[PDB]
Amino acid sequence: MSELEKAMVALIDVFHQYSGREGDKHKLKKSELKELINNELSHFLEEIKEQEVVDKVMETLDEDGDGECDFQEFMAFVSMVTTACHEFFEHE
Amino acid sequence: MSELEKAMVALIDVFHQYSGREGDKHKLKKSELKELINNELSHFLEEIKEQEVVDKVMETLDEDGDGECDFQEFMAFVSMVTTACHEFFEHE
Ligand SMILES: [Ca+2]
Ligand SMILES: [Ca+2]
Ligand SMILES: [Ca+2]
Ligand SMILES: [Ca+2]
Ligand SMILES: [Zn+2]
Ligand SMILES: [Zn+2]
């Protein structure tokens, strides 16, 4: 089975709905990261009330330092959220 | 629904099975990228017979230039594969 076919499809929907919420048509704006953290990753990621973490997360994820998260690094954000929930249960 | 819960779970399985195939326990080695492209992304991504593209993809994905793809950029790879299948259908 292509487990990756589930993710690629599950994200293109949440990626385009948010990245496409505003901007040209495929770029992530803070109003999505903070809104996506409180709306999507709100069951696994605490709903930040201050973009502050979103200000720090961008410092760890923003590679071009654009203050925004294109699709290449935006995914890398879920990976940073997915990695914490993966190393935690596997805490040797 | 947390569509992202599907991806995070769908990847932790393919991410740990490959990233955990060899190495410490959570790092991606070429033997996974080329093997993951021919085994997982083989229905959407052509099965490369030459790591050559994997040699070029790493040049576009490897940020630390480690010749390997940690979990933060490894995900960014699927995003580069997911983005091509997302902008193609949305080719205005
Ligand atoms: Ca946007
Ligand atoms: Ca960015
Ligand atoms: Ca590995
Ligand atoms: Ca790297
Ligand atoms: Zn789009
Ligand atoms: Zn692991």
From Swiss-Prot, chains A, B:
Gene responsible for this protein: S100b
Example of a GO cellular component annotation carried by this entry: nucleoplasm
Main location per the UniProt record: cytoplasm
UniProt: Ca(2+) 1 binding residues: S19, E22, K27, E32
Impact upon substituting C85A: Decreased zinc-binding
Alphabetical list of Gene3D superfamilies matching this protein: EF-hand
Keyword terms: Acetylation, Calcium, Cell adhesion, Cytoplasm, Metal-binding, Nucleus, Repeat, Secreted, Zinc
Subunit organization: Dimer of either two alpha chains, or two beta chains, or one alpha and one beta chain. The S100B dimer binds two molecules of STK38. Interacts with CACYBP in a calcium-dependent manner. Interacts with ATAD3A; this interaction probably occurs in the cytosol prior to ATAD3A mitochondrial targeting. Interacts with S100A6. The S100B dimer interacts with two molecules of CAPZA1. Interacts with AGER. Interacts with PPP5C (via TPR repeats); the interaction is calcium-dependent and modulates PPP5C activity. Interacts with TPPP; this interaction inhibits TPPP dimerization.
SMART domains on file: EFh, S_100
Function: Small zinc- and- and calcium-binding protein that is highly expressed in astrocytes and constitutes one of the most abundant soluble proteins in brain. Weakly binds calcium but binds zinc very tightly-distinct binding sites with different affinities exist for both ions on each monomer. Physiological concentrations of potassium ion antagonize the binding of both divalent cations, especially affecting high-affinity calcium-binding sites. Acts as a neurotrophic factor that promotes astrocytosis and axonal proliferation.
Sequence positions that bind Ca(2+) 2: D62, D64, D66, E68, E73
An annotated Gene Ontology molecular function: calcium ion binding
PROSITE patterns registered for this protein in UniProt: EF_HAND_1 (PS00018), EF_HAND_2 (PS50222), S100_CABP (PS00303)
The EF-hand domain, residue ranges: 13-48, 49-84
Any one Gene Ontology BP term: response to methylmercury
Residue numbers binding Zn(2+): H16, H26, H86, H91
Taxonomic placement: Eukaryota, Metazoa, Chordata, Craniata, Vertebrata
Superkingdom assignment: Eukaryota
Substitution effect: C69A: Does not affect zinc-binding
Modified residues (N-acetylserine): S2
Name assigned to this protein: Protein S100-B
Induction of synthesis: Up-regulated in periinfarct ventricular myocardium.
